[PDB]
Write an enzyme that holds these catalytic residues in place. Structure first.
Site, PDB file in Angstrom:
ATOM      1  N   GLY A  69      15.859  45.415   4.128  1.00  0.00           N
ATOM      2  CA  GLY A  69      15.377  46.439   3.990  1.00  0.00           C
ATOM      3  C   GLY A  69      14.423  46.623   2.782  1.00  0.00           C
ATOM      4  N   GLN A  70      14.111  48.425   2.305  1.00  0.00           N
ATOM      5  CA  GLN A  70      14.020  49.446   2.255  1.00  0.00           C
ATOM      6  C   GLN A  70      12.381  48.338   1.387  1.00  0.00           C
ATOM      7  OE1 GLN A  70      17.707  49.750  -0.133  1.00  0.00           O
ATOM      8  NE2 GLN A  70      18.688  50.372   1.475  1.00  0.00           N
ATOM      9  N   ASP A  71      12.881  47.582   0.199  1.00  0.00           N
ATOM     10  CA  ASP A  71      12.143  47.218  -0.583  1.00  0.00           C
ATOM     11  C   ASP A  71      12.517  46.005  -0.630  1.00  0.00           C
TER      12      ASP A  71
END
Ligand SMILES: Nc1nc2c(ncn2[C@@H]2O[C@H](COP(=O)(O)OP(=O)(O)O)[C@@H](O)[C@H]2O)c(=O)[nH]1
Ligand SMILES: [Mg+2]
Length: 175
Positions: A69-71
């Site tokens: 994920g995300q970052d």
């Protein structure tokens, strides 16, 4: 019942059992924890961004958290004596299995989760554009895996089809 509560007996006794449940966002790992009806789900936020839910009927602990994920999804994740790895996949997401493949493959590489039985839940099998288990089993390359004993039960968390059939398997394996 608790038809489920019951598959886990024999496993009942003083060392902690730990079952990891991870997968990408929207695979249905949360509906899975809730339908499982084994106690009430306690959310914790161990490090900023890493939302970790958990449940526990006596000594069987179900730890769950998103992946891919995300970052930065992270270290802090480097697993005590987790004997069961349940990996859930959104059958309707053809785009993301490939990530679901980087995430299954990345975790299984680890030292810690080394002798950990693989049960995969091919999940949204109720949608007209579904990807059957066989398609999920190629698209994840579980037939190359020359070590683990694994399995893939098609399900539908929502109504819970396949959960008892997929967990009779894990149970016996760890048994
Ligand atoms: N049709 C269908 N939708 C599902 C199924 N399981 C999950 N969902 C739905 O899709 C979303 C899944 O989110 P959730 O279960 O929280 O997944 P999680 O982020 O991995 O914890 C919710 O709106 C669920 O209602 C399933 O088996 N069938
Ligand atoms: Mg969730």
């Amino acid at each position: 019942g608790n038809i489920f509560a019951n598959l886990f007996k024999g496993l009942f006794g003083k060392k902690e059992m730990r079952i990891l449940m991870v997968g990408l966002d929207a695979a249905g790992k949360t509906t899975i924890l809730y339908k499982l009806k084994l106690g009430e789900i306690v959310t914790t936020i161990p490090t900023i961004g890493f939302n970790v839910e958990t449940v526990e009927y006596k000594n069987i602990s179900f730890t769950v958290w998103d992946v891919g994920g995300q970052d930065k999804i992270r270290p802090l994740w480097r697993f005590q004596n987790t004997q069961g790895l349940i990996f859930v996949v959104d059958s309707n997401d053809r785009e993301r299995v490939n990530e679901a493949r980087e995430e299954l493959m990345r975790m299984l590489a680890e030292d810690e989760l080394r002798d950990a039985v693989l049960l995969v839940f091919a999940n949204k099998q109720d949608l007209p554009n579904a990807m059957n288990a066989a398609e999920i089993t190629d698209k994840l390359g579980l037939h190359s895996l020359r070590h683990r004993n694994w399995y893939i039960q098609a399900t539908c968390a929502t109504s819970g089809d396949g959960l008892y059939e997929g967990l009779d398997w894990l149970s016996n394996q760890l048994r």
